[PDB]
Amino acid sequence: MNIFEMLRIDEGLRLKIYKDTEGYYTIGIGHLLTKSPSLNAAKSELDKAIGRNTNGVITKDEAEKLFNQDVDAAVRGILRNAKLKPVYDSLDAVRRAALINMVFQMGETGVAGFTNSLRMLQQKRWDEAAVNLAKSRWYNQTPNRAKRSITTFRTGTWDAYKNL
Ligand SMILES: [Cl-]
Ligand SMILES: [Cl-]
Fold this sequence. Notes:
This protein is mainly alpha-helical. The protein is built from nine helices and three strands. It has a single domain, classed as Lysozyme, CATH 1.10.530. A hairpin with a 5-residue loop joins strand 1 and strand 2 (25-28). The termini are close together. The PDB classes it as hydrolase.
Protein backbone atom coordinates (compact mmCIF):
# COMPACT_ATOMS: atom_id res chain seq x y z
CA MET A 1 0.00 0.00 0.00
CA ASN A 2 1.14 3.59 -0.58
CA ILE A 3 -0.15 7.20 -0.65
CA PHE A 4 -1.37 6.91 -4.22
CA GLU A 5 -3.26 3.74 -3.66
CA MET A 6 -4.56 5.08 -0.42
CA LEU A 7 -5.97 8.28 -1.84
CA ARG A 8 -7.33 6.44 -4.93
CA ILE A 9 -9.39 4.37 -2.51
CA ASP A 10 -10.58 7.41 -0.60
CA GLU A 11 -11.47 9.65 -3.53
CA GLY A 12 -12.38 7.24 -6.31
CA LEU A 13 -11.97 8.14 -10.04
CA ARG A 14 -14.49 10.07 -12.17
CA LEU A 15 -13.82 11.25 -15.66
CA LYS A 16 -16.64 13.74 -15.89
CA ILE A 17 -17.12 16.83 -13.70
CA TYR A 18 -18.91 16.00 -10.46
CA LYS A 19 -19.81 17.52 -7.10
CA ASP A 20 -17.77 16.47 -4.06
CA THR A 21 -19.18 15.90 -0.54
CA GLU A 22 -19.34 19.69 0.03
CA GLY A 23 -21.03 20.30 -3.30
CA TYR A 24 -17.95 21.63 -5.11
CA TYR A 25 -17.07 20.95 -8.69
CA THR A 26 -14.35 18.36 -8.94
CA ILE A 27 -12.97 15.87 -11.42
CA GLY A 28 -10.61 12.86 -11.66
CA ILE A 29 -9.18 11.69 -8.35
CA GLY A 30 -10.56 14.27 -6.01
CA HIS A 31 -9.14 17.22 -8.01
CA LEU A 32 -11.08 20.27 -6.77
CA LEU A 33 -11.81 22.65 -9.63
CA THR A 34 -13.57 25.54 -7.98
CA LYS A 35 -15.74 26.50 -5.06
CA SER A 36 -17.84 28.65 -7.32
CA PRO A 37 -21.40 27.52 -7.93
CA SER A 38 -20.94 27.88 -11.72
CA LEU A 39 -20.42 24.93 -14.04
CA ASN A 40 -18.87 27.25 -16.51
CA ALA A 41 -16.31 28.53 -14.19
CA ALA A 42 -15.62 24.84 -13.46
CA LYS A 43 -15.34 24.05 -17.15
CA SER A 44 -13.00 26.95 -17.58
CA GLU A 45 -10.74 25.84 -14.69
CA LEU A 46 -10.73 22.31 -16.13
CA ASP A 47 -9.59 23.49 -19.56
CA LYS A 48 -6.89 25.59 -18.03
CA ALA A 49 -5.71 22.64 -15.88
CA ILE A 50 -5.54 20.12 -18.76
CA GLY A 51 -4.46 22.42 -21.47
CA ARG A 52 -7.20 21.81 -24.01
CA ASN A 53 -10.89 22.34 -24.68
CA THR A 54 -12.35 19.42 -22.74
CA ASN A 55 -15.99 19.98 -22.41
CA GLY A 56 -16.06 18.58 -18.83
CA VAL A 57 -14.63 15.20 -19.80
CA ILE A 58 -11.03 13.90 -19.44
CA THR A 59 -9.22 10.73 -19.97
CA LYS A 60 -7.75 8.37 -17.40
CA ASP A 61 -4.21 9.44 -18.26
CA GLU A 62 -5.22 13.12 -17.76
CA ALA A 63 -6.82 12.18 -14.41
CA GLU A 64 -3.64 10.49 -13.26
CA LYS A 65 -1.50 13.38 -14.30
CA LEU A 66 -3.59 15.82 -12.14
CA PHE A 67 -3.36 13.29 -9.35
CA ASN A 68 0.43 13.13 -9.49
CA GLN A 69 0.60 16.87 -9.43
CA ASP A 70 -1.80 17.07 -6.53
CA VAL A 71 0.08 14.63 -4.42
CA ASP A 72 3.36 16.42 -5.14
CA ALA A 73 1.76 19.72 -4.16
CA ALA A 74 0.46 18.23 -0.88
CA VAL A 75 3.86 17.00 0.11
CA ARG A 76 5.41 20.34 -0.83
CA GLY A 77 2.86 22.29 1.13
CA ILE A 78 3.59 20.18 4.19
CA LEU A 79 7.37 20.71 3.89
CA ARG A 80 6.96 24.38 3.43
CA ASN A 81 4.59 24.79 6.40
CA ALA A 82 6.24 25.67 9.72
CA LYS A 83 3.59 23.91 11.70
CA LEU A 84 3.38 20.81 9.54
CA LYS A 85 6.93 20.16 8.70
CA PRO A 86 8.11 19.22 12.12
CA VAL A 87 5.25 16.82 12.57
CA TYR A 88 5.80 15.10 9.30
CA ASP A 89 9.54 14.84 10.08
CA SER A 90 8.79 13.12 13.33
CA LEU A 91 6.52 10.46 11.91
CA ASP A 92 7.10 6.99 10.43
CA ALA A 93 6.31 6.23 6.78
CA VAL A 94 2.77 4.96 7.24
CA ARG A 95 1.64 7.85 9.43
CA ARG A 96 3.25 10.32 7.00
CA ALA A 97 0.82 8.99 4.44
CA ALA A 98 -2.10 9.80 6.71
CA LEU A 99 -0.87 13.36 7.10
CA ILE A 100 -0.61 13.74 3.32
CA ASN A 101 -4.17 12.42 2.97
CA MET A 102 -5.51 15.00 5.34
CA VAL A 103 -3.69 17.80 3.56
CA PHE A 104 -4.89 16.58 0.23
CA GLN A 105 -8.42 16.65 1.47
CA MET A 106 -8.45 19.89 3.44
CA GLY A 107 -5.53 21.93 2.49
CA GLU A 108 -2.46 22.91 4.41
CA THR A 109 -4.21 25.68 6.17
CA GLY A 110 -6.97 23.46 7.36
CA VAL A 111 -4.66 20.83 8.77
CA ALA A 112 -2.28 23.40 10.31
CA GLY A 113 -5.33 24.37 12.36
CA PHE A 114 -5.46 21.04 14.21
CA THR A 115 -3.02 22.38 16.70
CA ASN A 116 -3.64 20.15 19.58
CA SER A 117 -3.82 16.96 17.50
CA LEU A 118 -0.59 17.91 15.81
CA ARG A 119 1.20 18.34 19.11
CA MET A 120 -0.11 14.99 20.21
CA LEU A 121 1.09 13.25 17.08
CA GLN A 122 4.46 14.81 17.49
CA GLN A 123 4.53 13.45 21.02
CA LYS A 124 3.54 10.00 19.80
CA ARG A 125 0.42 9.86 21.99
CA TRP A 126 -1.56 7.85 19.41
CA ASP A 127 -4.78 7.10 21.24
CA GLU A 128 -5.04 10.56 22.52
CA ALA A 129 -4.44 12.14 19.13
CA ALA A 130 -7.06 9.85 17.62
CA VAL A 131 -9.67 10.98 20.13
CA ASN A 132 -8.84 14.64 19.55
CA LEU A 133 -8.87 14.26 15.79
CA ALA A 134 -12.40 12.86 15.98
CA LYS A 135 -13.77 16.01 17.63
CA SER A 136 -13.95 17.93 14.39
CA ARG A 137 -16.22 18.98 11.68
CA TRP A 138 -14.02 16.88 9.42
CA TYR A 139 -14.91 13.64 11.30
CA ASN A 140 -18.56 14.59 11.64
CA GLN A 141 -19.09 15.35 7.96
CA THR A 142 -17.05 12.43 6.45
CA PRO A 143 -16.86 9.86 9.24
CA ASN A 144 -15.85 6.79 7.28
CA ARG A 145 -13.04 8.46 5.49
CA ALA A 146 -11.85 10.34 8.54
CA LYS A 147 -11.92 7.07 10.49
CA ARG A 148 -9.58 5.48 7.99
CA SER A 149 -6.99 8.18 8.42
CA ILE A 150 -7.45 8.28 12.15
CA THR A 151 -6.93 4.51 12.48
CA THR A 152 -3.81 4.85 10.38
CA PHE A 153 -2.44 7.47 12.80
CA ARG A 154 -3.46 5.28 15.76
CA THR A 155 -1.89 2.01 14.58
CA GLY A 156 0.80 2.96 12.19
CA THR A 157 -0.42 0.17 9.84
CA TRP A 158 -2.62 0.03 6.70
CA ASP A 159 -5.25 -2.12 8.32
CA ALA A 160 -8.12 0.34 7.61
CA TYR A 161 -7.52 -0.02 3.91
CA LYS A 162 -6.98 -3.73 3.67
CA ASN A 163 -10.00 -5.22 1.95
CA LEU A 164 -10.86 -1.94 0.14
CL1 LIG B 1 -3.91 22.37 -11.67
CL1 LIG C 1 -16.92 9.49 4.59
